[PDB]
Amino acid sequence: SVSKANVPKIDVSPLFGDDQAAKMRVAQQIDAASRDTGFFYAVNHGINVQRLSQKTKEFHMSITPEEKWDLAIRAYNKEHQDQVRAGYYLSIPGKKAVESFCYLNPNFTPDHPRIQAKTPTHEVNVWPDETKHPGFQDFAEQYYWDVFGLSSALLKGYALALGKEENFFARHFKPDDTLASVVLIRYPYLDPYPEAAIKTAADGTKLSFEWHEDVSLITVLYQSNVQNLQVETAAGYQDIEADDTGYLINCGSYMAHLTNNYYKAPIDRVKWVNAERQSLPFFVNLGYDSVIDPFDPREPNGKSDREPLSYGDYLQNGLVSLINKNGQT
Ligand SMILES: CC(C)[C@@H](NC(=O)[C@H](CS)NC(=O)CCC[C@H](N)C(=O)O)C(=O)O
Ligand SMILES: [Fe+3]
Known part of the structure; x- marks a missing residue:
């Protein structure tokens, strides 16, 4: 038997405003959620998620095999050695059901000094033909x-929740250098669904994606209305109920590092469900050279002996390790 995770709905709208006490009340709710299962739903977020879902579906359902090869990351197309992050991640009929399209900061152009310097994790986005899409x-x-704007407000809530001034994280989250990414993931309905695309967990549960911690400061996720996520607790995995009007928020392992695990990065996994659906994460990443000094809210002096970690190194290592452990998506 599988229990259901407590995932509170938090009205985050005060984080966009100037009522400081109301922002502290949101911060308290973020703190409680981050110390419990690690997830909450952000509501009253102001984003038109219906249009997000509609436009994403229109793209997924109209892109052709030829277009997918033309946009494919290096894992699927050897001609595209510069595409480690951004581009199309192909399905393999009979073997791999999931497919997706990832894009990065639109300010990463050939003019951008990180592109000029060829710094790892920075890439110029690739796009299909405008007339075809x-x-x-x-x-x-x-x-x-x-979603950058929503995430900046959420970061204000996390800062206040930890006893900091509201810009403690957000000051590192900037349009000119953010390594944040959007991934538009399609999980298809398939009949028959090939068993090769289904993994079996240690506890026997059929999965589409195994347990992991997110590589992010925070993750800001929209999913369509098909239940699939489970969060690990000490008493076992618990189902996260779906909500296609909100954003599911959690901390990534960079947040766990800098808080000395006070806000843990929750471990979740994706149950196998034979249903057409969407999973559209925004990974809130900082700049390549961003360093946040670790602290420990449990200690009166807030002292932590954890070493400061540059975000770019964290991200490069984290994305490689996630592929190694959980497979190329
Ligand atoms: C659990 C969801 C967030 C979603 N999973 C995901 O978003 C998956 C698996 S954790 N994420 C990743 O592998 C990291 C993608 C990083 C991205 N290419 C980039 O360059 O920044 C799903 O539905 O599988
Ligand atoms: Fe996760």
């Missing part, structure tokens, strides 16, 4: 900035 790039770039 009218409005897609424009929608996707505006969405990046819409």
Whole structure:
């Protein structure tokens, strides 16, 4: 038998405003959620998630095999050695059901000094032909900035929750250098669904994606209305109920590092469900050289002996390790 995780709905709208006491009351709710199962739903977030879902579906359902090869990351197309992050992640019929499209900061252009310097984890986004996908790039770039704005407000809540001034995290989250990414993931309905695309957990549960901690400061996730996620607790995995009107929020392992595990990065996994659905995460990443000094809210002096960790190294190592452990997506 499988229990259900407590995932509170938090009205985050005060984080956009100037009522400081109301922001502290949101912060308390973020603190409680982060110390419990590690997840909450952000509601009253101001993003049109119906349009996000509609535009994403229109793209997933109209892109052709030829277009997928043209946009494919290096793991699927040897001609594209510069694409380790951004581009198309192909399905393999009979073997791999999931497919996705990842894009990064639109400000990463050939003019950007991190592209000029060839710094790892920075790439120029690739896009389908505008005439074949009218409005897609424009929608996707505006969405990046819409969810950036929500994430900046959520970061104010996390800072206040930890006893800091509201810009403690957000000051490192900037349009000119953020390594944040959007991934538009399609999980298809398939009949028959090939068993090769289904993994079996130690506890016997059929999975599409195994346990992991997120590589992020925080993760800001929209999913369509098909229950699939489970969070690990000491008493076992618990189902996270779906909510296609909100954003599911959690801390990633960079947050766990810098708080000395006070806000743990929750471990979750994806149950196998034979249903057409969408999983659209925004990974809130900082800049390549961002360093946040670790602290320990449990200690009166807040002292932590954990070493400061540069975000770029954290991200490069984390994304490689996640592929090694959980497979190329
Ligand atoms: C659990 C969800 C967040 C979603 N999973 C995911 O988003 C998956 C698996 S944890 N995420 C990743 O592998 C990291 C993607 C990083 C991205 N290419 C980038 O360059 O920044 C799903 O539905 O599988
Ligand atoms: Fe996760």
